């Protein structure tokens, strides 16, 4: 035959499987792979198989537009009965790889085929009984996920009469296969599969749910089950919208038809291709990082890139950057631990863009976890032992503090926590580790994380006439583990109102239908800086630091304020380390020390009562 | 732990099997040293070394200097900690009464005097030690707790730092809140 397939003998499935037409279509698919070329004249598929061989891959992606344009008839019969043509084109791809590469079967016995660019897009609610055993393309969100399981591929059997091991028999992924004849014995007795001589592949089940935005008002989202085989497993984790191309078919096995009631069937989708509807770098990016670092005034370059969707609050943003870069931990002889994570506290009046700051930090950090003292959240703060609903096994789970080891833990509504949450937070901050004694398990988990918190004052309004300790429900042991306290007051002013109101109204009008470093580069900059920079100190700044500390101590004791203690010196050193890290330098300059001094002194002064505050403003005017 | 074994399957989709591991070796990283897993045998070299160290005329000074050399001052506190770690001598009497031999110490002070780092060092340096606060820890009580077994539905000691640290030292922070 030669492009005479437009003649129809009987139903499409029967036609496609005849040996002669099978050979015809196989040869024509091989010619499609070997000959297809675009206008540029480059061998798109040639390069595809070349890179497949170079990378030692297992699958080739194919475009439906090219195949349609070239061989409309083959494209149509593919859309109708793809089950057989998957096998046919798998064999074609195997022979193509053999032609390009020698003895590829030595490593991989199969090359899978992935289709792409299918013209029609469906929703999970549109599938009906005219789509069964056909090719579909849908989209939705991932809601659950099973583990990876092994499935039989090349089964070998044991004869119980003679110990012969019958040779491999292919498993088709349709129904379990059996054998009945032993060649040596000429027998038919019992058989058992050989576990140690069988080859398996990967199996995974995924449940897809529609995107809530697309559901027309008044109805509810639908869902389906998806099957992922081989190297499609562990590609789409829960919580991401994806596009899946597969074959829509029933559970023809079912359970049995003796069941009472109407004879109805369940259906699944066998995925052929999956796609999604980073913090790594390279030398190309490393050179640009170093170039940007060398420029003067890089700290203020970075600070202006924090939370672009908020106006003002420069102190908040510099503190956020400092806690987002971090210092260097230390340990002397392995018997005296010093922490390197900088904690900040946001204490402001209602309507001051605190939750937005936390959301930005969550969206910009490499490992950020969101919790709260009130409301629904994906995780709590305490460790516990709970059943797994789907696997039905006991599991050990830590809180957001354990989960964010070497990261940042964000807590919203810090003033509304209960006793258990307070105890967990206190232990994590004091010891950087969480204990547990539950259900026969005694252990300790690491809790070395950075904390950014937001709260409200008593009564919802700040009383500037009293010290900070009497404006919040928190206690001294917890409040003293922070080193950057930020106080936001909604004082009424005219120019500020103009600026904020114009910002807000412009924002809204832009979003009606009808200097700063780029963020995508900033993420990689932060990751690289944390990964590769460990600044040190020079003993020549000891005199300056000691003199400043003595001045602060003397003034604090004279004015009868909250005591200045060595914790502030350690915070100053940590912030200086972070500022040095911001520049990619290996040493801490005097300018970083000055910036840290300003930050800590301003934080300390801003948290006192009005009289003490104004007295301390004059004394420390140098900074 | 670190485990070496064989990745295998068994029969409990269409052709699915359940994986599991056949253990060939176990390597433990040393966890939760308690009174039930102590070692009461000493090598002869260690014994001779310790006897030699005992005779040092300046042993008390060296031991005092060893406790947290990274903190300044508080010589009396450190000597108290030496006496605490060593412990007294217990006496059992013919009538049944017990005269304890352990030592209790309290630390009143202002914020930022390095009295939590001393507790942390004592925790890190004692053979058996639990460091906790009043109200216990996250998902870990401060005193003995009795719970019913999830499957057999019967009593056992669920936990409690006070009994877990039997034969050791318990470090309590924020003693005024409980």
């Amino acid at each position: 035959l030669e492009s005479l397939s437009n003649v129809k003998a009987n139903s499409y499935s029967e036609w496609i499987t005849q040996p002669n037409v099978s050979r015809t279509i196989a040869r024509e698919l091989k010619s499609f792979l070997l000959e297809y070329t675009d206008e540029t004249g480059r061998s798109v598929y040639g390069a595809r198989i070349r890179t497949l061989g170079e990378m030692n891959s297992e699958s080739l992606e194919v475009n439906y537009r090219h195949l349609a344009e070239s061989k409309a008839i083959l494209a149509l019969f593919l859309a109708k009965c793809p089950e057989e043509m998957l096998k046919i084109f798998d064999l074609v791809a195997m022979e193509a790889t053999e032609l390009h590469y020698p003895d590829y079967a030595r490593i991989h016995s199969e090359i899978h085929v992935r289709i792409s660019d299918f013209p029609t897009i469906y929703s999970l609610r549109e599938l009906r009984e005219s789509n069964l055993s056909s090719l579909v393309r849908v989209t939705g969100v991932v809601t659950r996920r099973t583990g990876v399981f092994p499935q039989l591929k090349y089964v070998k059997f044991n004869c119980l009469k003679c110990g012969s091991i019958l040779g491999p028999f292919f498993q088709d992924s349709n129904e379990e296969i059996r054998i009945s004849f032993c060649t040596n014995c000429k027998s038919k007795g019992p058989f058992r599969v050989n576990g140690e001589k069988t080859v398996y592949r990967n199996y995974q089940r995924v449940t897809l749910q529609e995107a809530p935005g697309t559901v027309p008002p008044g109805r509810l989202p639908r869902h389906r089950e998806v099957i992922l085989l081989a190297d499609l497993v562990d590609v789409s984790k829960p919580g991401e919208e994806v596009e899946v191309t597969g074959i829509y078919k029933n559970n023809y096995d079912g359970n049995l038809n003796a069941k009472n009631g109407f004879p109805v069937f369940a259906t699944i989708i066998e995925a052929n291709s999956i796609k999604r509807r980073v913090f790594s770098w390279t030398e190309e990016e490393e050179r640009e990082f170093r170039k940007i670092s060398r420029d003067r005034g890089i700290i203020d370059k970075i600070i202006s890139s924090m939370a672009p969707s908020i106006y003002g609050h420069r102190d908040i943003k510099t503190a956020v950057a400092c806690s987002l870069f971090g210092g260097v931990p230390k340990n002397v002889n392995g018997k005296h631990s010093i922490r390197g994570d900088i904690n900040v506290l946001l204490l402001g009046d209602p309507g001051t863009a605190k939750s937005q700051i936390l959301k930005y930090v969550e969206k910009t950090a490499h490992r950020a976890v969101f919790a709260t003292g009130q409301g629904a959240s994906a995780v709590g703060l305490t460790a516990s032992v709970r059943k797994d609903p789907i696997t039905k096994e006991w599991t050990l789970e830590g809180g957001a503090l354990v989960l964010a080891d070497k990261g940042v833990c964000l807590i919203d509504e810090f003033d509304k926590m209960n006793d258990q949450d307070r105890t967990s937070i206190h232990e994590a901050m004091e010891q950087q580790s969480i204990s547990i004694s539950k259900a026969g398990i005694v252990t300790t988990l690491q809790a070395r994380c950075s904390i950014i918190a937001a709260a409200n004052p008593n009564g919802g309004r700040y009383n500037s006439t009293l010290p900070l300790a009497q404006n919040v429900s928190l206690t001294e042991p917890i409040l003293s583990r922070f080193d950057i306290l930020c106080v936001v007051r909604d004082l009424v002013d005219e120019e500020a109102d103009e600026r904020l109101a114009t910002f807000v109204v412009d924002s809204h009008v832009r979003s009606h239908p009808e200097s700063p470093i780029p963020q995508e580069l900033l993420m990689k900059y932060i990751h690289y800086a944390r990964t590769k920079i460990y600044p040190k100190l020079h003993q020549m700044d000891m005199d300056k630091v000691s003199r400043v500390y003595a001045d602060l101590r003397r003034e604090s004791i004279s004015t009868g304020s909250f005591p200045i203690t060595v914790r502030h010196l350690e915070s100053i050193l940590r912030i200086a380390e972070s500022f040095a890290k911001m520049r990619l330098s290996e040493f801490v300059s005097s300018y970083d020390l000055d910036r840290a001094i300003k930050v800590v002194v301003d934080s300390f002064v801003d948290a006192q009562k009005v009289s003490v505050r104004r007295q301390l403003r004059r004394s420390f005017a140098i900074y | 732990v670190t485990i070496v074994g064989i990745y295998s399957i068994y029969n409990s989709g269409v052709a699915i099997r359940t994986p599991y591991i056949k253990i060939l070796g176990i390597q433990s990283d040393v966890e939760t040293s308690s009174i039930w897993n102590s070692v009461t045998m000493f090598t002869e070299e260690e014994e001779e070394e310790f006897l030699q160290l005992s005779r040092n005329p300046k042993l008390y000074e060296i031991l005092t200097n060893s406790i947290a050399p990274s903190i300044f001052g508080n010589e009396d506190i450190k000597k108290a900690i030496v006496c605490l770690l060593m412990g007294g001598s217990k006496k059992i009497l013919p009538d049944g009464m017990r005269l304890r031999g352990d030592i209790n110490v309290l630390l009143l002070g202002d914020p930022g005097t390095a009295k939590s780092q001393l507790l942390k060092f004592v925790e890190k340096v004692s053979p058996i030690a639990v460091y906790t606060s009043g109200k216990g820890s996250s998902a870990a009580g401060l005193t003995a707790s009795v719970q019913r077994d999830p499957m057999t539905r019967e009593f056992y000691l669920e936990g409690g730092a006070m009994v877990l640290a039997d034969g050791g030292v318990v470090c309590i922070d924020e003693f005024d809140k409980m």
């Binding site: 499935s13 609610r125 599938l127 009906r128 009984e129 969100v141 809601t143 659950r144 749910q209 809530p212 559901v215 008002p217 008044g218 109805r219 509810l220 989202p221 639908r222 869902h223 029933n250 038809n257 003796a258 069941k259 009472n260 009631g261 109407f262 004879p263 109805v264 069937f265 369940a266 259906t267 969707s309 009046d349 209602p350 309507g351 009130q374 409301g375 629904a376 609903p389 789907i390 509504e413 409200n456 919802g460 309004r461 909604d490 009424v492 005219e494 109102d497 103009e498 904020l500 109101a501 114009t502 807000v504 109204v505 924002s507 809204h508 009008v509 979003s511 009606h512 239908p513 009808e514 | -």
Partner: protein
């Protein structure tokens, strides 16, 4: 090959679910009810094909008739097979199949009794036509299906056994318990034309706003501000999306505060009786699953399904909540989750899902102490929590003032209503007219103007300066003012917000804040 379906409709009479009798089994009638649940559409075995075993003969197009049926004899004398067959799932046909659960109408439930439910089966092209929370009129056949649950009931239950007289010699007994179901063929919901002329005439009025305000809750005396809130709650703002993924709300929420001796509940009753998709619920007669949603995993034929709650119903509508001050903490958190993100996350029985909850909330709250202490502020007189309290963009506190003319006028109105009944209402517009107007006007999406931005900024400055009362002012009130202004512009059927509407919105917002009285 083609499957043909007939569709009867417009029967002379309609039956209630409470008046179905086993006499009309197998006949065509019409019923009505409210839909409670719907399942997914699944293939249904219609004409099966089998392969004989003793011989390789093939049998095609075997009818099922409501149950899984097998061929009764080999079609050829070459084989004498019977009862030994295999099913071919590769050359058979299927039809779409759905199951729907309906409930009695509220006004049809007799005295002292709980409502009934009835299963309804849909086929073919009728599937996916009903919707939960809607009232539909069905037409089809009344049928019977097995009921294994009827064992244990009192009485004698028919049994069947094979007659053994006339059989040469030298156990299959069956039970005949059934229940009544309904297989329907036509379903229609029950709630342009010449009326475009009427619509154009009425929009071309000049004082249309005053009539629109007066026609809301005509049976309640006074309280114009609450009416102007209920209006502008039916008509809402526009939902906006930022480039970075920040979504801006378009819904307006209201809370009416008063003691049990006031008439705040009548507003909620009017809204639920009038608004298209509205649900009424009480603070203490509700539950967490009653709100939000539940999961019913015992789907007798296959996988699970979800059953909508109160918030799920009235999506893109209005939810009324009386006795709002008796909600617990968990339900308050659920309402706050709905208000913050227009979604409801359901996690039960190892099943996760997400559900839209884009709703506007109309709440009525009592003062904490029974009487509104005017010496305290709004926060000190309520029991709510700060998160939910900060999302209510209007607080209407209604109080009682003694005055001769007011009292006599109110008494005259009430006596008129009792004596005259329907006669003494005379509103400018009727409910159908308001519904048509609101349906038309909800599709305009007004926009701001260059002149309006600075005027709005100056109004916000004025309001902030004057604030420096019931509660302080923040930017949240600026967003609320924008929302209200655009809602008013929609209400006036204009494509651009003008400073007049901005002034109207500002005055409405300002008048709703009351002052705290102090001694001396």
């Amino acid at each position: 090959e083609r499957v043909f379906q007939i569709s009867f409709f417009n029967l002379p009479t309609v039956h209630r679910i409470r008046d179905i009798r086993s006499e009309k089994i197998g006949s065509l009638l019409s019923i009505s009810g409210t839909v409670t649940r719907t399942s997914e559409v699944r293939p249904e075995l219609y004409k099966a094909s089998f392969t004989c075993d003793m011989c390789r003969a093939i049998v095609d197009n075997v009818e099922q008739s409501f149950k899984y049926t097998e061929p009764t004899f080999c079609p050829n004398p070459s084989c004498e097979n019977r009862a030994f067959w295999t099913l071919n799932v590769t050359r058979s046909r299927f039809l779409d199949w759905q199951k729907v659960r309906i409930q009695e109408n509220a006004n049809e439930i007799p005295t002292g009794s709980m409502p009934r439910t009835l299963d309804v089966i849909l086929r073919g092209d009728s599937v996916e036509r009903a919707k939960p929370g809607d009232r539909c009129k069905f037409t089809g056949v009344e049928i019977v299906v097995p009921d294994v649950t009827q064992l244990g009931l009192p009485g004698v239950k028919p049994s069947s056994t094979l007659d053994t007289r006339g059989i040469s010699k030298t156990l299959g007994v069956r039970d005949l318990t059934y229940k009544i179901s309904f297989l329907a063929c036509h379903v229609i919901s029950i709630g342009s034309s010449d009326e475009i002329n009427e619509l154009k005439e009425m929009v071309k009025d000049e004082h249309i706003y005053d009539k629109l305000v007066r026609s809301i809750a005509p049976a309640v005396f006074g309280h114009e501000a609450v009416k102007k809130g209920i209006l502008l709650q039916m008509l809402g703002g526009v939902h906006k999306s930022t480039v970075e993924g920040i979504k801006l709300r378009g819904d307006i929420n209201i809370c009416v505060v008063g003691d049990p001796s006031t008439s705040k509940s009548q507003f909620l009753k009017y809204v639920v009786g009038f608004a298209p998709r509205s649900v009424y619920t009480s603070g203490k007669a509700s539950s967490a699953a009653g709100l939000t949603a539940a999961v019913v995993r015992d789907e007798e034929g296959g996988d699970y399904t979800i059953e909508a709650g109160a918030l799920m119903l009235a999506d893109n509508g209005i939810c009324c909540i009386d006795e709002f001050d008796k909600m617990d903490i968990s339900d308050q958190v659920a309402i706050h989750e709905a208000m913050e993100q227009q979604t409801i996350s359901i996690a039960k029985a190892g099943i996760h899902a997400t559900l839209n909850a884009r709703t506007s909330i109309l709440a009525a709250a009592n003062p904490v102490g029974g009487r509104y202490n005017r010496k305290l502020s709004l926060r000190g007189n309520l029991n709510m929590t700060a998160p939910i309290m900060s999302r209510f963009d209007l607080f209407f506190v209604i109080l009682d003032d003694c005055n001769e003319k007011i009292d006599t006028e109110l008494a005259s109105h009430i006596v008129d209503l009792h004596m005259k009944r329907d006669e003494a209402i005379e509103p400018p517009f009727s409910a159908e007219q308001l519904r048509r107007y609101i349906k038309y006007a909800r599709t305009f999406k007004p926009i701001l103007t260059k002149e309006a931005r600075s005027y709005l900024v100056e109004k916000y400055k004025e309001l902030r300066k004057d604030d420096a009362s019931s509660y302080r002012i923040t930017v949240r009130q600026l967003e609320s003012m924008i929302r209200l202004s655009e809602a008013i512009a929609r209400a006036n059927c204009v494509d651009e917000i003008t400073p007049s509407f901005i002034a109207e919105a500002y005055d409405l917002l300002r008048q709703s804040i009351i002052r705290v009285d102090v001694d001396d």
